[PDB]
Amino acid sequence: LSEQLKHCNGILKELLSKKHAAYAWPFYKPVDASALGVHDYHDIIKHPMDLSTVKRKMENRDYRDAQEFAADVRLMFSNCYKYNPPDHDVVAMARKLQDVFEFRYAKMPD
Numbered sequence: 001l002s003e004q005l006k007h008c009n010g011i012l013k014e015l016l017s018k019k020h021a022a023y024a025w026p027f028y029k030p031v032d033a034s035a036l037g038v039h040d041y042h043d044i045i046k047h048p049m050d051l052s053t054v055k056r057k058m059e060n061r062d063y064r065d066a067q068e069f070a071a072d073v074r075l076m077f078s079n080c081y082k083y084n085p086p087d088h089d090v091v092a093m094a095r096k097l098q099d100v101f102e103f104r105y106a107k108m109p110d
């Protein structure tokens, strides 16, 4: 990986670590629409994203730069903000996790 992608992988590891598990856990795996009974999810969300998919893409060297990585992580949060009411518990968790993401992403080495 490039230096910037290393930093991205570091952030990714952090997002998946125990210290953030209390609010990161909904984002660990792809939304299972049928299991959650949200039968309109895939009509509303055209591009599902989650941290296991980001991890797989990082491992497979799918991401060519930090920008592409960040777009996926942000897409994941956006999907949450799109589907759920602004006052929902899972949205609060998304906001907190994105705060973790954005502040460390900002420390990207040049």
Ligand SMILES: CCNC(=O)[C@H](CC)[C@@H]1N=C(c2ccc(Cl)cc2)c2cc(OC)ccc2-n2c(C)nnc21
Binding pocket: 025, 026, 027, 031, 032, 036, 038, 041, 079, 080, 083, 084, 089, 090
């Ligand atoms: C119909 C109630 N809303 C939902 O089920 C959400 C839409 C699928 C769902 N809520 C959750 C969710 C709801 C309440 C709380 Cl406290 C935490 C997560 C959700 C749960 C999961 O369990 C494996 C996985 C993904 C979840 N997720 C994400 C990401 N974005 N929205 C959700």
Ligand SMILES: C[C@H](O)COC[C@H](C)O
Binding pocket: 095, 098, 099, 102, 103
């Ligand atoms: C809560 C907003 O949707 C995302 O905020 C990011 C900021 C760095 O906390």
Ligand SMILES: [Cl-]
Binding pocket: 070, 071, 074
């Ligand atoms: Cl972006």
